[PDB]
Amino acid sequence: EVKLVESGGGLVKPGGSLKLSCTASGITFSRYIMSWVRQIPEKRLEWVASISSGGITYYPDSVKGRFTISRDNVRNILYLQMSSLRSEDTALYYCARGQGRPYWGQGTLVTVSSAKTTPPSVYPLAPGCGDTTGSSVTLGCLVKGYFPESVTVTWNSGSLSSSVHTFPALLQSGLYTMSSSVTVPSSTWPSETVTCSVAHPASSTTVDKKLEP
């Protein structure tokens, strides 16, 4: 099996420092040019740093002097030490074996902010106008007031992606709001349970709502 796994991400104050790590199964870092690259909301990937097999290090002038890439050849660990962090360094960071057939991990999120990790409020979206609802029923959950991204909304342990829609989060005076809808036949619900499960790993919170008529 072959995979890279980044770790270390989280919230850091402007001007602060943070160190990311990357481990691997099946890739021996010392043999390769290993890199870090980051993904910022609007943009294609951005290169952050590389280290050759011989230990020579390479940086774009955008981070040179602030970021340091290193490798522990023996334990097979790749590191990115970041200092003097700026809001613009906010990104998902990936380690990569870019030569040949490129490999990269799932990424680790670094958020540079003076704001505080805040859990969501979760509100059920169930029909309530008149007591009529069609052949198929649309239900939802409104996930309000959380920071940072992201949240995951899972319907019935994922069994229902029965037209699940996940709407992108919108920022509003410091906090995020998103929503998620699901559509089921009216024969199924409310005669059977539909639950939205909202995970916010950053605030160590999960909230489940059973939607009710």
Binding site: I33, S35, V37, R44, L45, W47, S50, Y58, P60, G98, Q99, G100, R101, P102, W104, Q106, G107, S121, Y123, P124, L125, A126, P127, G128, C129, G130, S136, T138, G140, L142, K144, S163, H165, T166, F167, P168, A169, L170, Q172, T177, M178, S179, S181, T183
Partner: protein, 218 residues
């Protein structure tokens, strides 16, 4: 640096037909070892970038043989035979010939399908929200095609724009439609001073809008 250039958008493709995405590089990616160090990856919302092809023509793991890539050292094309709904996303070319690593700006693949009106659903503020003095009224406008749509809010029959925020999905990986959430957020006090709330959706499908509504005192 080796600059990789690709268009933001491609011709919309009907399911079951071919798509072609072009890219080019300022320097030949053909190495003296005879390998061309072009790779392609796919980005979809909610998941990690996925490698498709590497060394110009070699399929990566898990990638079906409807994907192929060809080119010279400087001009390349990714082809998808028999496009499927799940292929929608943004396709990037990039080079791994030399440092610095460089990447193309991505080309969005858009699927062409039959027109579909939106399914419109309206929801009053949950009691739970009102208990904290907030009032969000939510309208989903779901599974429509094509992507252009407009939403309008009426409170006691009178247009309301302020306090409305909209969010749009990317094209659905199952049915190639688009969806929208529209939320009208008000204080609990202003919510409770009005009775009729309405969502109305205008879409090329119909010259008349789909309107959904409730009366708060019910």
């Amino acid at each position: 640096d080796i600059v990789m250039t690709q268009a933001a958008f491609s011709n919309p493709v009907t399911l079951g037909t071919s798509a072609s995405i072009s890219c080019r590089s300022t320097k030949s990616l053909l190495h003296s070892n005879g390998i061309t160090y072009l790779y392609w990856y796919l980005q979809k919302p909610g998941q990690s970038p996925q490698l498709l092809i590497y060394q110009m023509s070699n399929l990566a793991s898990g990638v079906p043989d409807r994907f192929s890539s060809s080119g010279s050292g400087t001009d390349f094309t990714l082809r998808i035979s028999r496009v499927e709904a799940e292929d929608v996303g943004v396709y990037y070319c990039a080079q791994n010939l030399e440092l610095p690593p460089t990447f193309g700006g991505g080309t969005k693949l858009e699927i062409k399908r039959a027109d579909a009106a939106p399914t419109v659903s309206i929801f009053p503020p949950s009691s739970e929200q009102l208990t904290s003095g907030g009032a969000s009224v939510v309208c989903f406008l779901n599974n429509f095609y094509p992507k252009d749509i407009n939403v309008k809010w009426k409170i006691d029959g009178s247009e309301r724009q302020n306090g409305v925020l909209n969010s749009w999905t990317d094209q659905d990986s199952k049915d190639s439609t688009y969806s929208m959430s529209s939320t009208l957020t008000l204080t609990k006090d202003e919510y409770e001073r009005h009775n009729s709330y309405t969502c109305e959706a205008t879409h090329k499908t119909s010259t008349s809008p789909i309107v959904k509504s409730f009366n708060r005192n019910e």
